[PDB]
């Protein structure tokens, strides 16, 4: 089956701000990737095996607003740039890749899936270079193999003149190690 | 909610149209030189390529454009007019084999539809089912490159 994706905005600026301070969010959850945000920036969190992972450079050491109040992180790894909260009731989790494919597909914040060729444990090259802005807000998002299993989480683009040509990602192995 | 694939009809028959690069592409053997309906009257074809069996009008109302493939994968996925997805293995520029043959009726009215790669991007436009005794075992398609060239 071909990887297709769609986004949906669940709340806005003011509603976000209040929920940030309140720490209580009653909205219904759906999806494998949650578009997430702080008062500072927006990024993505990917649910894999029951844990909603995201990038530490975005989530920091913050709690996640849930229907029962703020939820403390389950995992935190400043060096590997990871944080994980228990996946929200309602989200769907992806599962790690078990086919060692090198043909990866990055899902962006705008629900666009782009192909990237694996060029190392934590790097892949965009078969079609795009300006960095296209990737803006996509950290924490998934890098799927052809079968839709999680290969890694997008960490940072590798751009030059403002054009992203490659991407650095957190291989799903660092996740298993962060939980260890 | 916008759709990339339009289900279209003529007095004669029904088939599909796929929006790519702001153009609503379909099979010439389906639409001919026919103009497309619009709330403001019939809008004429932006491209007509009989040789390629390809025509295209400006993308209609309530549609979004599909991105062309750039990974060169041979694992295609044909989408039928009933929204079914059929895995096809690319055997060449304009041909691919259904990983599981289907009765000719299964693919009926899907000409014009897209052949997606693993990323959901357009590899080509379904042109014709290649059948053997009522069982379509493979398909003919128009590479997006042709669309890209026609423009």
């Amino acid at each position: 089956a071909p990887i297709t994706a769609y986004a949906q905005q669940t709340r806005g600026l003011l509603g976000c701000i209040i929920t940030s301070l309140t720490g209580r969010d009653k909205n219904q959850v759906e999806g494998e990737v949650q578009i997430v945000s702080t008062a500072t920036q927006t990024f993505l969190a990917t649910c894999i095996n029951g844990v909603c992972w995201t990038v530490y450079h975005g989530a920091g050491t913050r709690t996640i607003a849930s229907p029962k109040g703020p939820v403390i992180q389950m995992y935190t790894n400043v060096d590997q740039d990871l944080v994980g909260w228990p996946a929200p009731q309602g989200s769907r989790s992806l599962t790690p890749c078990t086919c060692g494919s090198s043909d990866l597909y990055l899902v962006t914040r705008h629900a666009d899936v782009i192909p990237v060729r694996r060029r190392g444990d934590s790097r892949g090259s965009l078969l079609s270079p795009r300006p960095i802005s296209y990737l803006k807000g996509s950290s924490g998002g998934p890098l799927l193999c052809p079968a839709g299993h999680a290969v890694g989480l997008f960490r940072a683009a590798v751009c030059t003149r403002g054009v992203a040509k490659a991407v650095d990602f957190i291989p799903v192995e660092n996740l298993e190690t962060t939980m260890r | 909610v916008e759709g990339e694939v339009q289900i279209v009809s003529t007095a004669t028959q029904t088939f599909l149209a796929t929006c790519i690069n702001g153009v609503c592409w379909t099979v010439y053997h389906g639409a001919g030189t026919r103009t497309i309906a619009s709330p403001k009257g019939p809008v004429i074809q932006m491209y007509t390529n009989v040789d390629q069996d390809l025509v295209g009008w400006p993308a209609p109302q309530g549609s979004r454009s599909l991105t062309p493939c750039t990974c060169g994968s041979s694992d295609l996925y044909l989408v039928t007019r009933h929204a079914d997805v059929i895995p096809v293995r690319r055997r060449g520029d304009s041909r691919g084999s259904l990983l599981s043959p289907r009765p000719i009726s299964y693919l009926k009215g899907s000409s014009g539809g897209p052949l997606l790669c693993p990323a959901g991007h357009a590899v080509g436009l379904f042109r014709a089912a290649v059948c053997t005794r009522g069982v379509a075992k493979a398909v003919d398609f128009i590479p997006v490159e042709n669309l890209e060239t026609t423009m």
């Binding site: 297709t4 | 909610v1 339009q6 026919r34 309906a37 599909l66």
Partner: peptide, 16 residues
Amino acid sequence: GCVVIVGRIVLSGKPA
């Protein structure tokens, strides 16, 4: 004659 749009398909399965 004239081609008419009788329906639409969304590849992502995005609900309204």
